[PDB]
Symmetry: C2
Subunit: 452 residues, 2 copies
C-alpha cells in the first residue's frame, strides 16, 4: 500500500474494480467532464480510453471519494485526514532528501516531441470555461536566490500550442519566486499525472511549509524511498521523474493576458482577467502516458478537507471537551461549513465549540454542532438534527462584521456574517432524544439477488 | 537574579527599598490585613515585624505588583508573563530532578516544637472570614499508588492548635490523591510548606493542562533558582517536605471526614459559603531559625498569580488565529479571570470580531472581552472606558454569546452556565484622522528643578 507513480494507482484501482473504463470516443470539449460529472463522488475513478482518438487516455475523479483514496493506502475513509497529517508530521521531523537521477533513467524523459499542447487531450471542463485547462498539474520551481524548491498546484489555460495563462493567487510562493526573477524571468516544470503524495505536498499550506522550506519531501512519505527528480533541458528547472507528462516552462513578470473563466471552489466562475502568460519551452512523456485531470467539485473539496480537518479538530478538542470529529462538508465547498460532532459532558460546551471552530478557520460561514449519534458527514442526518434538536431561539449564534473568504459572495471584500447552529440534544440526556436503532447486519451472511 | 528561598526575596526587596516595615505591634485579627489592604497594588510588599509580639514576623503583598515580581528576576512588569512561561517550557522539555537531603541539612528542620498552630501569627484577613487562614501554603503530596508528587495551593482554616479545615475544589489533583487513600483504606499524608519562593508558587498554581495528574510540576520551581529543588523526608514517612520553606506542617486527612470551614474571600470579591469540608490534622511542625510567616491578601495578589500564568498562553492562542495581536490583559477589575482586554494593530476590517471569538474560546471563565487598538493602554481601565466612549459602535460592536459554559463561582454563571459579551472598541479601518489621539511631548522631569509642596 505504497505508490511510486500514477501507473501504480491505476493498476491498483483496476485490480480493485474501482475503475470505470469509458471505451467509446468522447470529445475533450465539455462531453468528457459531463460524463465524469454523472459519476462525481462514487467509490470509483474514470479512465477515458479514447478522447478524440488520442493515444493518450485521461483519468479523472481520483480525489472525489475518501473511500477510494483510503483503499489505495489501506486506511478507512474516516482515518485518511489523520493518516495524511501523521505523514506530514514525520516529514517535518525527519525529511527525505530527493534523489537526482540521469535524464535517460527518468521514465518521463522517454519522449520529447515538438511542443504541441493541442495534441494533448486536455479537457474543456465547465460549459463557460475560457478554454482547455490543466488543473491536476503540480508546479516545481527553484528559488532564483537560494535554489530551494517550492511545489504548488495552479490552473493553467491553453492559449495556443506553446502558450498557457496561469492563475497565481496573492501570497502564493510561486508569486514570491516570480518577484525575485523580476529582480534579474522565472523557469519551472508543470508535472501532470503524479501520485497523491505529490498532490498533498503541492496543496500543503504556507503555515505548514514556509517560503524558505521544500514541501516536496512530503510525497516521499507515500512511497518506498525518496522522490525522484531530474535536471530539465533548462537548466534553471527541476522535473518530477515519475510524472506521466512534464512541461518545462518560463514566465516573465508584468506580462499579463486574459485567462478564465474557470470554476472556483464556490461553484461559481472566476472573472476572466489579465493574469501571467507562461511559455512552454519543452514537453516530456512516459510511454503509455495517461493524462490526469480534476473535475472542479468534490475532487477539490476532499483535497482541502483531508489536509485541513485534523488541525481544526486538534484546535477545537484542545479548547472543548468531548470533541470526536470535524467535517468540512462537500455542501460547504470543503471550506464554508464545518460540522462538529461531540459527546456532551455539560450544558454550554456546545456554544464554546462554535466559538472555537469559527476562530480556528476564518473562511467558515456556518458551523453546526451535533451529538455522537448523528452522522456529521451525512447532510440528511444533520438536517434531521436541525429538525428535531436545534432550539431556533437559543441555538442560533450570529456573528456580524467579521472577516471571511472574499471568493464566497456572502463575504464581499473578505467581510460579512457567520452563523452557528447548536443542533445538540438537551443535556442531561433525556429519553425523548434517544434515536431508534435497527440491528446491524452483515449482508454477506445471506443469499441476496438484487435486480434481474 | 535567582532565589533559593524566601530569605533571598526579602533581602533583595529590603536592599531595593521595596519593603514596608511595620514596626508597631499589630493584631493578627483583622488589623494586619487592614494595613496590607491600604498598600494593595503598590510597588512594595509589607513586613510586619511585630504581630501580637510573636518572634515570627509576617510578609504579605509579594504578588500584588508585577513591577515588584519583575524587579526580583530582572524583568520589566510587561515581560513577566513571558518570562514565567518560557521557564515552564524549559521544565516541560528538560525537567530538573529534585535533590533529597538529610534531615539535619534541611534549614526548615532547625526546630520541631510540639504542634501549636495558635503560636503562629496566622492572620484573620477579611472581617467575616470564619477564622485565621493559611493561604500562601503550597501542599506537596505523594500519589498513594505511584508516589509521584503533586504541588497545589489551597486555603486552610485553623480550627484549634492541631486541626485545619481545607477547601478542595472539584477536579483538583489533591482531590484525586485523597480518592486513592480512601479507596486504599489509609488516609492521605502531605506537607503544607509556608514561606516559599515564587518558583514554588508558580509550580503550585500551574494548571492541569500544563502539568497532568500523572506529572510532577514541582521542578518548575528549579527554573527560578540555581540548582534543583531541595526536598527532605518528613517524620511521616509517606510525606515529602520542602527543605527551604520558612515553616512546614506535616499533615494527615481522611476522606468523608468533614467539618464547617469558611467563610473566606473568593476571586469574585464575595465570600465562600461556610460548609462541611475536609478536616486535616497537623502531625508535626518544622521551622527555620529566623522564619517569616508568608500570607496572601485576597485581591490583586491572586489576580496577578492567575494573569502571570495565563496571559502568555492566551496571547499565543489568539495571535495564532488573528493577525496583529500585541498583548492580552486579564484585568484586575475582572478578578484576573472574567475580563480580557486584547490590544491589536488592525490590518483589515473584521479581524477585531475574530479576536473576540478566539479569546472567548481560549479562556472559558471569561465573561467580557474588550478589543482595543495599539494606542490604548489595555491595562488602564480609564483608557479602555475612553475607547468605549469614542470608538465602540454600540449597534455593531457588541457580540453576545448565550447559554455557554463559564465559571460557577461568578454569580453571572449559576451552575457554570450563562452569557458572555464582547466589546469591539476599535477605531474604524482604514485608519482615519478623526480617531488620531492627541499627544503631549515626552519630558524627563529630572532635567528640571521642581519643588512639589511644603
Ligand atoms: C487542490 C487545489 C489547489 C489549488 C487549485 C486547484 C486545486 C484542485 C484547482 C486546479 C482545481 C484550481 C486552481 N488551484 C489554484 C491554487 N492556487 C492558486 O494560486 N491558483 C489556483 O488556480 N490551488 C492551491 C495552491 O496550490 C495551494 O494553496 C498551495 O498550498 C500553494 O503552495 P504554497 O503554499 O507553496 O504557495
Ligand atoms: C493562586 C491560588 C490558587 C488557589 C487558591 C488561592 C490562591 C492564591 C487562595 C489561597 C487565595 C485561596 C485558595 N485557593 C484554592 C485553590 N484551589 C482549591 O482547590 N482550593 C482553594 O482554596 N487554588 C487553585 C489551585 O492551587 C490551582 O488551581 C492549582 O493549579 C491546583 O493544582 P493541581 O492542578 O496540581 O491540582
Ligand atoms: Mn510552499
Ligand atoms: Mn498537578
Ligand atoms: Na505547497
Ligand atoms: Na499544580
Amino acid at each position: 500500500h505504497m505508490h511510486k507513480d500514477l501507473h501504480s494507482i491505476i493498476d491498483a484501482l483496476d485490480t480493485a474494480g474501482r475503475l470505470i473504463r469509458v471505451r467509446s470516443q468522447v470529445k475533450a470539449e465539455h462531453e468528457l467532464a459531463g460524463i465524469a460529472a454523472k459519476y462525481e463522488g462514487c467509490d470509483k475513478a474514470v479512465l477515458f480510453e479514447n478522447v478524440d482518438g488520442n493515444d493518450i487516455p485521461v483519468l479523472m475523479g481520483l480525489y472525489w471519494s475518501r473511500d477510494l483514496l483510503g483503499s489505495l493506502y489501506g486506511v478507512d475513509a474516516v482515518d485518511m485526514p489523520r493518516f495524511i497529517t501523521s505523514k506530514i508530521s514525520h516529514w517535518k521531523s525527519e525529511p527525505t532528501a530527493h534523489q537526482l537521477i540521469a535524464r535517460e533513467h527518468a521514465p518521463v524523459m522517454a519522449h520529447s516531441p515538438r511542443v504541441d499542447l493541442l495534441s494533448l487531450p486536455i479537457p474543456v471542463h465547465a460549459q463557460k470555461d475560457g478554454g482547455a485547462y490543466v488543473d491536476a498539474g503540480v508546479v516545481i520551481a527553484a528559488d532564483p536566490d537560494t535554489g530551494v524548491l517550492n511545489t504548488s498546484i495552479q490552473r493553467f489555460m491553453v492559449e495556443n500550442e506553446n502558450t498557457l495563462h496561469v492563475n497565481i493567487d496573492a501570497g502564493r510562493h510561486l508569486g514570491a519566486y516570480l518577484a525575485k526573477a523580476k529582480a534579474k524571468p522565472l523557469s519551472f516544470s508543470l508535472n501532470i499525472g503524479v501520485h497523491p503524495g505529490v498532490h498533498f505536498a503541492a496543496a500543503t499550506p504556507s503555515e505548514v511549509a514556509p517560503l524558505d522550506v521544500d514541501e516536496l519531501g512530503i510525497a516521499a512519505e507515500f512511497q518506498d524511498g525518496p522522490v525522484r527528480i531530474v535536471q530539465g533541458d533548462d537548466p534553471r528547472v527541476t522535473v518530477l521523474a515519475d510524472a506521466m507528462i512534464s512541461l518545462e516552462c518560463q514566465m516573465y513578470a508584468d506580462d499579463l493576458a486574459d485567462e478564465g473563466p474557470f470554476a472556483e471552489v464556490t461553484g461559481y466562475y472566476a472573472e476572466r482577467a489579465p493574469r501571467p502568460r507562461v511559455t512552454v519551452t519543452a514537453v516530456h512523456l512516459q510511454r503509455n502516458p495517461v493524462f490526469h485531470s480534476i473535475l472542479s467539485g468534490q475532487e477539490v473539496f476532499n483535497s482541502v478537507g483531508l489536509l485541513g480537518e485534523s488541525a481544526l479538530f486538534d484546535q477545537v478538542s484542545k479548547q472543548v471537551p468531548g470533541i470526536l470529529e470535524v467535517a468540512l462538508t462537500d455542501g460547504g465547498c470543503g471550506f464554508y461549513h464545518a460540522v462538529v460532532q461531540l459527546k456532551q459532558v455539560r450544558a454550554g460546551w456546545s456554544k464554546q465549540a462554535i466559538l472555537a471552530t469559527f476562530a480556528a478557520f476564518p473562511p467558515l460561514k456556518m458551523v453546526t454542532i451535533v451529538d455522537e449519534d448523528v452522522d456529521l458527514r451525512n447532510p440528511r442526518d444533520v438536517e434531521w438534527a436541525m429538525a428535531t434538536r436545534l432550539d431556533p431561539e437559543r441555538g442560533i449564534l450570529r456573528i456580524d462584521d467579521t472577516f471571511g473568504h472574499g471568493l464566497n459572495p456572502s463575504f464581499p471584500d473578505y467581510f460579512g456574517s457567520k452563523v452557528g447552529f447548536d443542533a445538540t440534544r438537551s443535556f442531561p440526556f433525556e429519553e425523548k432524544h434517544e434515536r431508534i436503532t435497527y440491528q446491524d447486519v452483515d449482508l454477506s451472511r445471506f443469499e441476496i439477488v438484487e435486480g434481474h
